[PDB]
């Protein structure tokens, strides 16, 4: 099966969190987002 909605967005990094939340919530009105700072080793 496949998860509908934009399964992979572009790269709005630094494009304001709220902004990205609008594009993600607008593309997949069936998914929520969570804001969090950095800490764990993320894909460098």
């Amino acid at each position: 099966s496949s998860c509908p909605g934009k399964s992979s967005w572009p790269h709005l990094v630094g494009v304001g969190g709220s902004v990205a939340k609008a594009i993600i919530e607008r593309q997949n009105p069936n998914v929520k987002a969570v804001i969090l700072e950095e800490g764990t080793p993320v894909t460098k």
Binding site: C3, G5, S7, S8, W9, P10, H11, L12, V13, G14, V15, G16, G17, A20, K21, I24, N28, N30, V31, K32, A33, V34, I35, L36, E37, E38, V42, T43
Partner: peptide
């Protein structure tokens, strides 16, 4: 719990929001 219904967004104190291009 990173499902296709939960998007995590990271933010670097540098004053930027590192949002993962993908969901989980």
């Amino acid at each position: 719990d990173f499902r296709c219904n939960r998007v995590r967004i990271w933010v670097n104190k540098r004053g930027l929001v590192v949002s993962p291009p993908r969901i989980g």
